[PDB]
Design a protein around this ligand. Sequence first.
Ligand SMILES: CCS(=O)(=O)Nc1ccc2c(c1)[C@H](/C(=N/c1ccc(CN3CCCCC3)cc1)c1ccccc1)C(=O)N2
Length: 285
Amino acid sequence: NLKADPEELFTKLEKIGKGSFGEVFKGIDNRTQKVVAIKIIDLEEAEDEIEDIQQEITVLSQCDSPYVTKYYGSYLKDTKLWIIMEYLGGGSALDLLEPGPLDETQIATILREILKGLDYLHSEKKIHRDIKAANVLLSEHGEVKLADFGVAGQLTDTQIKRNTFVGTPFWMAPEVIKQSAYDSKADIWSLGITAIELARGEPPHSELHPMKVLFLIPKNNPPTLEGNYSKPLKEFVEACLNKEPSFRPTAKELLKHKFILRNAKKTSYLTELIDRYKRWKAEQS
Ligand SMILES: CCS(=O)(=O)Nc1ccc2c(c1)[C@H](/C(=N/c1ccc(CN3CCCCC3)cc1)c1ccccc1)C(=O)N2
């Protein structure tokens, strides 16, 4: 269902970031005057990644959730592909970490929304496979959505597990690194690492070369959250970071976790985090 002549319907504005496969631009929907995001891919240089580009479009087109970046369509224009998506003016959760530590209400609120996205994807038999703070995007008013579906996996009636080596090493589950038959529980491990990332600012082993962590993650005991954090947050992380995937809770189960129930609050409060970043960035030299 590829479409054509995107500039009849959309206006391309300035670059707002680097994405997977290409650059992302702000844009305007000329029908509504709402702002959109436009990922532009040069298909002439897209030798090999073409399969992942195709997967991103396919997965996006099949999702309809408030917790997954909305998809407006894909348009061909010369050698370039325009992937038109929901605009999220708060940028990534990773960027919002830069000014300093989050508090546990912020951590819980963000994790809750990520969990609602994972619950949706997993119920659709989709596995994100690159869960990390960089792929968690916020609206300017604090709504949270999962993004970047280029390496997402799809389970079917004839394929009940995946085994592809994909993801970002520090966040990868041990069974993904070993390329065992795995499923949505791999996302739950990555969620645990992301919880540490949100709490401490960086995932475990962040100082090391990624090739080193590829042997450390299966070799070592799972990471734990160290430092002055509430018992339920430490236990949330521990529950996610089990070497045995079948012992990890589902996203649905984690939405009932004491840490989430006690600490998550209205998403609109996350606007404070966006304002904190704007202030920080404006002062930055
Ligand atoms: C996983 C990131 S991706 O592969 O570029 N895909 C993607 C999909 C949908 C999107 C986006 C990316 C954006 C997207 N939006 C965005 C990025 C950066 C800003 C600017 N910041 C915003 C926060 C206050 C200070 C300035 C505003 C919006 C984006 C682009 C590139 C990297 C991370 C986030 C968006 O609004 N919608």
